[PDB]
């Protein structure tokens, strides 16, 4: 939950510096967005509506904890 | 910790359960190079892939770092060579050994895991476009496995 | 990377105790001044400044995976897999050194009959003894 | 440990102190040994004046450290 | 020949030195890259502090040698 000292340009992963990356996912739109913390990777489905995307992201982040 | 690494090297050179050949390089026991043969009944068959392993100084208390030096076409393997593997990330235990992780890598190559992909494009291609996945994997193996 | 813990090798600079005390007073002033600091400290520092004893739970924050291996050694099995002894090997700026957790720690071999004390000594040395003087200066500066 | 205090022309005196001891305690010990009040004592180490509110470890003062007393 | 200088956790840098040059030359060459003045840089090797007057030959320095860099804690 801590941003890098310098900022988001200092994002680091297992292999070293790695900036936040968002990758399209063609799976079923009902699929909850997935993430890989080892590379700050976020696989996101192309939600048609902003409300649906917000709900899915909220569900993902809340279920993470 | 060097004794554990020596034991693992002796075991690998004695009876390596996995279809692979790995050993230290540059006179350093903490840096290793490994070769994984292409499993049969798969487009990777007939191809050998090269991997680089870095052993943490706290081994076996810390998982080894594994990267795919050889370019491969796999949903769960990054193009740059990064890998996703639970046993090396959160499930690592001191009881685990280099041979065990090599066997796990060989299996993952045998059965991909589209459910947790590092490249959604390849995952979708494999799931719904098996012919394209097989063809592209064969081409990549021919180009960068031999 | 965001959070830091005091460095064992701070002894290279003779003035490190005074600088730790200065860090303590500046942190105290920041708390008084209500100026938030993006810096973070390992759980050991917070527990010690609050006076609570430090245990493997603090070790979890510093070395999550390594703490997992330690707890697995202690409880999840009977270990007896590594020939580690009651000593710690370190590389201080190219100089290889060995520090004995207990008297004669180098020779005594770690076993299931002495793992419970081995892990306790390891964590105590890592968190408290290795930083005793520096953390005491930090605490007196803060208070 | 012990430290030594030397004047410009006088002899050298020995004071048993600890890192937590403040320079005020050092001046008090100097007064007890010689009678000079703290206000009349100026302490220098490594060419730097020593303040009352700080301690020995602050200025990197260790065992057998030599200080200069100026009145 | 070439030598390597590394910080506690930062990157590593390479200098082009020779045995005869004093540690002053090494500190100056470090300065051109990072900018730390020589008076502030503390250079260590094999766990023993170095000195400006001596040189690489005095410290039996050789090829592909790694030194450790620290920033001075001025006392006052």
UniProtKB/Swiss-Prot annotation, chain A:
Localisation: Nucleus, Nucleolus
Catalytic residues as annotated in Swiss-Prot or TrEMBL: 38
Superkingdom of the organism of origin: Eukaryota
Cysteine pairs bridged by disulfides in the record: none
Coiled coil, from the record: none
Family under the similarity heading: Belongs to the UPL family. TOM1/PTR1 subfamily.
Note: Present with 350 molecules/cell in log phase SD medium.
Record note on quaternary structure: Interacts with the ADA3/NGG1 subunit of the SAGA complex. Interacts with KRR1.
Reported function: Probable ubiquitin ligase protein involved in many cellular processes, such as transcription regulation, maintenance of nuclear structure, cell cycle, mRNA export and rRNA maturation. E3 ubiquitin ligase proteins mediate ubiquitination and subsequent proteasomal degradation of target proteins. Involved in transcription regulation by interacting, and probably mediating, ubiquitination of some subunit of the SAGA complex. Required for SPT7 ubiquitination. Participates in mRNA export from the nucleus by regulating the transport of hnRNP proteins.
Name of the featured protein: E3 ubiquitin-protein ligase TOM1
UniProtKB/Swiss-Prot annotation, chain B:
Active site: 84 (glycyl thioester intermediate)
PROSITE patterns on file: UBC_1, UBC_2
Keyword Transmembrane helix: no
GO cellular component terms attached to this protein's record: cytosol; extracellular exosome; nucleoplasm; nucleus; protein-containing complex
Pathway where it operates: Protein modification; protein ubiquitination
Record-level GO BP terms: protein autoubiquitination; protein K48-linked ubiquitination; protein modification process; protein polyubiquitination; protein ubiquitination; ubiquitin-dependent protein catabolic process
EC number: 2.3.2.23, 2.3.2.24
GO MF: ATP binding; ubiquitin conjugating enzyme activity; ubiquitin protein ligase activity; ubiquitin-protein transferase activity
Record's keyword terms, sorted: ATP-binding, Nucleotide-binding, Transferase, Ubl conjugation pathway
Database matches in Pfam families: UQ_con
InterPro entries: UBQ-conjugat_E2_core, UBQ-conjugating_AS, UBQ-conjugating_enzyme/RWD
Domain UBC core: from-to ranges: 1-146
Effect of residue 92 to A: Abolishes histone H3 ubiquitination and decreases interaction with PHF7
Catalytic activity: S-ubiquitinyl-[E1 ubiquitin-activating enzyme]-L-cysteine + [E2 ubiquitin-conjugating enzyme]-L-cysteine = [E1 ubiquitin-activating enzyme]-L-cysteine + S-ubiquitinyl-[E2 ubiquitin-conjugating enzyme]-L-cysteine; S-ubiquitinyl-[E1 ubiquitin-activating enzyme]-L-cysteine + [acceptor protein]-L-lysine = [E1 ubiquitin-activating enzyme]-L-cysteine + N(6)-monoubiquitinyl-[acceptor protein]-L-lysine
Disulphide-bonded residues: none
Cited SUPFAM superfamilies: UBC-like
Family, per entry: Belongs to the ubiquitin-conjugating enzyme family.
Annotated function: Accepts ubiquitin from the E1 complex and catalyzes its covalent attachment to other proteins. Catalyzes 'Lys-48'-linked polyubiquitination. Mediates the selective degradation of short-lived and abnormal proteins. Functions in the E6/E6-AP-induced ubiquitination of p53/TP53. Mediates ubiquitination of PEX5 and SQSTM1 and autoubiquitination of STUB1 and TRAF6.
Protein name: Ubiquitin-conjugating enzyme E2 D2
From Swiss-Prot, chain E:
(Microbial infection) ADP-ribosylthreonine PTM sites in chain numbering: 66
Result of altering residue 7 to D: Impairs ubiquitination by CRL2(KLHDC3) E3 ligase complex
Outcome after substituting residue 9 to D: Impairs ubiquitination by CRL2(KLHDC3) E3 ligase complex
Site (Essential for function): 68
Residue ranges occupied by any Ubiquitin-like domain in the UniProt entry: 1-76
Subcellular locations according to the entry: Cytoplasm; Nucleus; Mitochondrion outer membrane
Effect of residue 65 to E: Phosphomimetic mutant that binds and activates PRKN
Residues that bear Phosphoserine: 65
Outcome of swapping residue 44 to D: Impairs ubiquitination by CRL2(KLHDC3) E3 ligase complex. Impairs ubiquitination by CRL2(KLHDC3) E3 ligase complex
Record site: Interacts with activating enzyme: 54, 72
UniProt modification remark: Phosphorylated at Ser-65 by PINK1 during mitophagy. Phosphorylated ubiquitin specifically binds and activates parkin (PRKN), triggering mitophagy. Phosphorylation does not affect E1-mediated E2 charging of ubiquitin but affects discharging of E2 enzymes to form polyubiquitin chains. It also affects deubiquitination by deubiquitinase enzymes such as USP30. Mono-ADP-ribosylated at the C-terminus by PARP9, a component of the PPAR9-DTX3L complex. ADP-ribosylation requires processing by E1 and E2 enzymes and prevents ubiquitin conjugation to substrates such as histones.
Consequence of changing residue 65 to A: Prevents phosphorylation in case of mitophagy. Decreased localization of PRKN to mitochondria
Residue numbers bearing the ADP-ribosylglycine modification: 76
Cross-linked residues, Glycyl lysine isopeptide (Gly-Lys) (interchain with K-? in acceptor proteins): 76
Documented effect of changing residue 42 to E: Impairs ubiquitination by CRL2(KLHDC3) E3 ligase complex. Impairs ubiquitination by CRL2(KLHDC3) E3 ligase complex
Effect of residue 72 to K: No effect on ADP-ribosylation
Membrane topology of the entry: Peripheral membrane protein
Effect of residue 60 to R: Decreases affinity for UBE2R2 in CRL2(FEM1C)-UBE2R2 complex
Cross-link (Glycyl lysine isopeptide (Lys-Gly) (interchain with G-Cter in ubiquitin)): 6, 11, 27, 29, 33, 48, 63
Function: Exists either covalently attached to another protein, or free (unanchored). When covalently bound, it is conjugated to target proteins via an isopeptide bond either as a monomer (monoubiquitin), a polymer linked via different Lys residues of the ubiquitin (polyubiquitin chains) or a linear polymer linked via the initiator Met of the ubiquitin (linear polyubiquitin chains).
Protein's name in the database: Ubiquitin
Organism: Homo sapiens
Gene that encodes the chain: UBC
